[PDB]
């Protein structure tokens, strides 16, 4: 045993479910009409909405 000691730290990841709660009309979401931009890869024309 050399003079010093070690104190290893180690993070561990837990997959987990989680339950949210929020009040009635806690927040508004103002929205506009969706829109369609156009792009062209010349093999197929992607669109974006």
């Amino acid at each position: 045993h050399p003079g010093f000691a070690l104190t290893a730290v180690r993070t561990d990841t837990f997959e987990v479910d989680m339950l949210l709660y929020s009040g009635k009309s806690c927040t508004s979401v103002i929205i506009n009409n969706p829109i369609v931009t156009k792009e062209e890869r010349d093999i197929s024309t992607t669109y974006h909405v």
Partner: protein
Amino acid sequence: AMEANIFCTFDHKLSIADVGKLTKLVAAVVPIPQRLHLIKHYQLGLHQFVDHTRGYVRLRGLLRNMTLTLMRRVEGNQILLHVPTHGLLYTVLNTGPVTWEKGDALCVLPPLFHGPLARENLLTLGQWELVLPWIVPMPLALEINQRLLIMGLFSLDRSYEEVKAAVQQLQTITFRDATFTIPDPVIDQHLLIDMKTACLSMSMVANLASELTMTYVRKLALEDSSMLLVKCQELLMRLDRERSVGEPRTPARPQHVSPDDEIARLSALFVMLRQLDDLIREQVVFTVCDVSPDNKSATCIFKG
């Protein structure tokens, strides 16, 4: 209105299993010798330029001039082939060995399949096959282009074990991806004619210039406007170690040279750069903007 294309037809009949192999290359470059409208399959692809004695540089030098073309849409009995325009993005299939990241500057090169077999064979048809040029990032082309030139300079020296080993090291490039060894141009103890002519183009420029440039540099260094040709007169010496206490104080210059032959040596110096020009400057032909997942399709803005 319809997009402009180039129709291609197969003199030999096509199998249901064969036409399915074309739908795989529907988005791949297919070089054409000459812009035309109707094309038989014989003039299609790079296979017409295969030779036995002629090597990699023949393919490269003719490949510079061929008209690049994507396959567009298999018709069963016909094939469309769009000619790309400069400055519009075209998708291309990744025939090249190396994966392309976004922003890479691609360029076309002859196929460089090495000895042990991997996926190569697709479209045997009547003693004919559709060889396709490699599409490769610019730096890997700059590197392959030199590996072959050095194996050509070593083609004369295969007796030595040191060169025998160094050739093997040049043979296997190590790239940021799975590695792909480069086939040795030397074969049957004897170099192919193309690499021999190209190595002559390099060694003439390396040797004809050394004896020639002193007759001019000695005269230009007098003026001093530029102020480095005096420093260049020492650069001519080609000494590696610091000079001994012996001969060198000035570079060696030709003596007495007969008045007219100096023109012929001068012009022969310039004739060899023309032989070398096909290898001197690679040129980009695509600039990929985004890449598909699995690095299989890419969408490159065309260049050239």
